[PDB]
Amino acid sequence: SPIEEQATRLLKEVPLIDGHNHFPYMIRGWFRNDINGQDAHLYDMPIGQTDLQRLQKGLLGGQFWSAFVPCPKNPDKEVGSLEALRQTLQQLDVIHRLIERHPTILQFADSAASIWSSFRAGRVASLIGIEGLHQIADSVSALRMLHRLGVRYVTLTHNCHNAFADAATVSPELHGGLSRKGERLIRELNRMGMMIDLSHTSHEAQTQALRLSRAPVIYSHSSIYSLRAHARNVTDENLHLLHRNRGVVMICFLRELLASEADQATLAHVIDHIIYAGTRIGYEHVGIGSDFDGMLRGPDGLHDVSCYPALVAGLLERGVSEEDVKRVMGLNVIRVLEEVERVAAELQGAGEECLCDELDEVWNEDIKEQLTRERERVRKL
């Protein structure tokens, strides 16, 4: 088929970069992160929408792999938040090991340049996102260390409220958008070069973040509110503010975000959502954010990671230009990451002060006086 040949050509010319996929959590669920001697299963998985053979088959160019851990269920909230941090390091560890053990398929990327080098080498550019500020145990130091471990976006919330911002699905609303700490965290995220992800956050929190951020943001996996009313989809107001922000909405394959009856959700509906956003805020602000493995069953025609060529072909069939399809596939999210990094370099070059954690005093006045007296003794020598 000529349109299928066109789609295959595009997938080899530009990387299709998907915004969100939970294969790392499936590995935690199925293998408990022990992948030693499990290559046969990692290539042909007995569960889920992602494995290494189907990943190749769908011609995906890059992937933000989610280092998701669930909300803390512990009644002692200090313990649950700290437990979430340990589990986050477990998920980052298995992502890095998955990449390192399959270097002919996966190559770690943390920048626009590293995405392209991976794609030139025929590798799936493998980036990392965390899904909620519950994962950092209320530590901006931990967050910066997660950045050093390769995390390049932070979803401000999952379906858990936190000290910084409001999730969408939970009511009553805690902060009513962003907290004062949330506002201050946006400055730090921009300064360090961490991409802000507004998926799973409340409509008001999105509006505030879109007005405050000095760098373009993403929705790693959400769809269009005007086509399907859901707390997780992006309103017309926030689509406009996303345009002004220069950000990208990465359209989600979750059936419940595409249709009122989930079993009616299709590939056509995903294309409807992409075209709606593209028409109204331009095709330079729309992406693809499957959320594969964040669901049991995908839409008709988008059942797993092998189905991306059908999406590319579907967009071309509906009249979306070759150049605009390339933008939706991955050039837009590359641009956002590039601009996020440029903003960070500009702020770090200007010597902007970093956000520090509030720490306990470890020394009393007696220890400090002993130390200052000792220093003066040394000065006299």
Next chain:
Amino acid sequence: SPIEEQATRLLKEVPLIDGHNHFPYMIRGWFRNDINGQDAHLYDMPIGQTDLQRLQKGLLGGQFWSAFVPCPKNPDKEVGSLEALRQTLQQLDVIHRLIERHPTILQFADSAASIWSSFRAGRVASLIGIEGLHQIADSVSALRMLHRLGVRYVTLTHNCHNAFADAATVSPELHGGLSRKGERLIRELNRMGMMIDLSHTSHEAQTQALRLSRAPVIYSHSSIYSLRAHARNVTDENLHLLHRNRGVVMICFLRELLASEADQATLAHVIDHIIYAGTRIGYEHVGIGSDFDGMLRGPDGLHDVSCYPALVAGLLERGVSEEDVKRVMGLNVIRVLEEVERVAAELQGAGEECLCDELDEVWNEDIKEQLTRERERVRKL
């Protein structure tokens, strides 16, 4: 003075690499890790044995900066261990920020090659060690992520017993050397290329680790038991096993490890300890491991980081050859790190399986059956 000129020449030819220094903890104590606008104080500290001016003055070539956090004092042991992990990330964060904010003085290093490149550029090669397995919250995944953050040695204990090995200062002995988990951890440390540090561990734990390790180890800061009997100093038995191991004992400036009366401790005693080890196991197995800022007051002549030229001169005055002084200064610890990395490359090249954490089951049988049924539905398409 001709011997002082000789010492200055050596310090410019080869990096003096010190094994252990607690300046990061002093920054936590004094500034609570907020170093914004504190350069005047970081160069001229009102407390402690380390600052950036005196660091330059003593001509130090490199430093393993300790990311120490204290033993968990919380009666709930789960919480304390998790709290220690968060605090470890805080200390790694401030070390990286200290290096990044002063790039004319400090340059991050994690290898023999990066040590030399830092030294060629006139920078203090800045490496990182953690001081106890209490810092990893019983997570080998966390440990591997600490390695990715730049940690290149792990002291198996501080003055706290842990699930892996026995500290020296505490009695009664918990495991009686290494536990079964401790033995297994040695294999993983060798596989990942993490240098084993035997300072602060029990005599029996040292003997067992020295027999088991497939890579050379260090004592980052300990002295000689035969000259001063202390639980923290290295016995003749373990010095011999260190020789067989190809490791390095980095001699410590702690007054209590050098003399029975601490106020009698001197630069001469440190030199006595270096010469004892050098004479008996060869000068290729001895280093310098100050533990500056792990004490209030240093030995006479070794009061702070500005005093390293006096040590180099002192060794030359006592008849230690120019080549052997260069070995003690830093070539030995460079060799150990190089061999640790080579052993890791050999084991990783052979495809040796990594140690995995024991995780809880997140899915029940019902969820797994739903997943397998869904996979089969997809196979039929």
